[PDB]
């Protein structure tokens, strides 16, 4: 039994209704009327809470404000009026047949804001660091939305791939932006072979893409 | 009040076996199902294994190839998973879940406990090298890397310095050692006076790292 969740991320001003969908590859309805469908929120750096059981049954201490419902093989989570507390991962969870049980791949909440364009920073390698044999890079997209946002390293004109890793924060509470983290990896020899490095950004808030350098040796 | 308190973090080999444990308290033992689940780190949950305390056989997800095996001490009130022959696909938090009671059905699972991290690597346990990120705006930080296993906390000013401050998620290195950064934004014009300190803690290791940051 395979559950497929849509969409795998949802935006929602405060205030305005979410629903998310979750379908069943066969019916869940144990041959009783109970469907065993379950809805849990994970929230940032916390343990799974559950939701909704049983399809439509809200569990103890949950606002009023989820429900849930489906009969069979779609279900859907309903929050009459999106908090703020509720962005996290949504996940559905069927039981219909030990030990067959199985989650869907969730959907992650967030509060919807107006475009903000990333303010970007480039960092050298620290000579600490030069001193042991490897070079990072380090790009820094700041307080920007929506999360979709492309990085692109250059070396003296020359596009980079393979040789660099990204991560990107949680949304943050107060303005409901992305920060953004790029790290360009380099043996030393290969960092002191070339002179211009150029962080290359791209995000719907910028009309043309923005592009940080420096060349190595200040 | 239910409370469920599982053994903490583990560190292990390609091939090994782990064993996580979680105690628990405050309701009938041997009335209600447990669960494992566990959750790759950026991943989804999974669902792993079940057994009522006391006279239980525990059920499998079949992924798992007969690799788990759950068991339980009702005289302690704890259960236990231990995951053999573990890859890194292994690496993942652990949970142990109190599920319905007995009368009711296995699920849902109403109460968790806090997770277990489980790391495989054949890396072993090293604390970071701090780097220094240096500066209307200035931006500044500290690359915190080449460590192992996770996890790391980073403040700025023994805490003092709290807006602007962002620090992101480490990214996991093809030599297996993880590298997170650190950054904050503040005025330009305080560069020169005010100083800038990131406060480094890798538990793992027992190590605490202070790095002045300077333009």
């Known amino acids: 039994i395979v559950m497929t969740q849509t969409p795998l991320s949802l935006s929602v001003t405060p205030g305005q209704p979410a629903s998310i969908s979750c379908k069943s590859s066969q019916s869940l309805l144990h041959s009783d009327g109970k469907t065993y469908l379950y809805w849990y929120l994970q929230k940032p750096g916390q343990s799974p809470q559950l939701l909704i059981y049983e399809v439509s049954n809200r569990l103890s201490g949950v606002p009023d404000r989820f429900s849930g419902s489906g009969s069979g093989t779609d279900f859907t989570l309903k929050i009459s009026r999106v908090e703020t507390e509720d962005v996290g991962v949504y996940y559905c969870?069927?039981?219909?047949?030990?030990?067959?049980?199985?989650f869907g791949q969730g959907t992650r909440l967030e509060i919807k804001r107006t475009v903000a364009a990333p303010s970007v920073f480039i960092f050298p390698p620290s000579d600490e660091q030069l001193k042991s044999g490897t070079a990072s890079v380090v790009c820094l997209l700041n307080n920007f939305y929506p999360r979709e946002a492309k990085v692109q390293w250059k070396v003296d004109n020359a596009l980079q791939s393979g040789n660099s890793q990204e991560s990107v924060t949680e949304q943050d509470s107060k303005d409901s932006t992305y920060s953004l983290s790029s790290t360009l990896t380099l043996s030393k020899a290969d960092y002191e072979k070339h002179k211009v490095y150029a962080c290359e950004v791209t995000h719907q808030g910028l009309s043309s893409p923005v592009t940080k350098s420096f060349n190595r040796g200040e | 009040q239910v409370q469920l308190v599982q053994s903490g973090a583990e560190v292990k080999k390609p091939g090994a076996s782990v064993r996580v444990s979680c105690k628990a308290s405050?309701?009938?033992?041997?009335?209600?199902?447990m669960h494992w689940v566990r959750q790759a780190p950026g991943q989804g949950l999974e669902w792993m294994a079940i057994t009522y305390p006391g006279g239980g056989s525990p059920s499998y997800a079949p992924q798992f190839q007969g690799r788990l095996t759950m068991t339980d001490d009702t005289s302690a009130t704890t259960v236990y998973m231990d995951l053999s022959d573990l890859t890194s696909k292994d690496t993942a938090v652990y949970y142990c879940?109190?599920?319905?009671?007995?009368?009711?059905?296995?699920?849902?699972?109403?109460?968790w406990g806090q997770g277990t991290l489980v790391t495989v690597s054949s890396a072993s346990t090293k604390g970071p090298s701090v780097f220094p990120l240096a500066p209307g705006t200035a931006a500044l930080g500290c690359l915190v890397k080449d460590y192992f296993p996770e996890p790391v906390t980073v403040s700025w000013n023994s805490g003092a310095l709290t807006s602007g401050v962002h620090t992101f998620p480490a990214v996991l290195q093809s030599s297996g050692l993880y590298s997170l950064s650190s950054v904050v934004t503040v005025p330009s014009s305080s560069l020169g006076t005010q100083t800038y300190i990131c406060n480094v803690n890798h538990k793992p290791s027992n190590t605490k790292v202070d790095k002045r940051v300077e333009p």
């Open positions: 969870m069927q039981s219909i047949q030990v030990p067959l049980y199985t």
């Open positions: 405050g309701y009938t033992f041997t009335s209600y199902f």
């Open positions: 879940a109190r599920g319905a009671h007995r009368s009711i059905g296995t699920t849902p699972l109403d109460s």
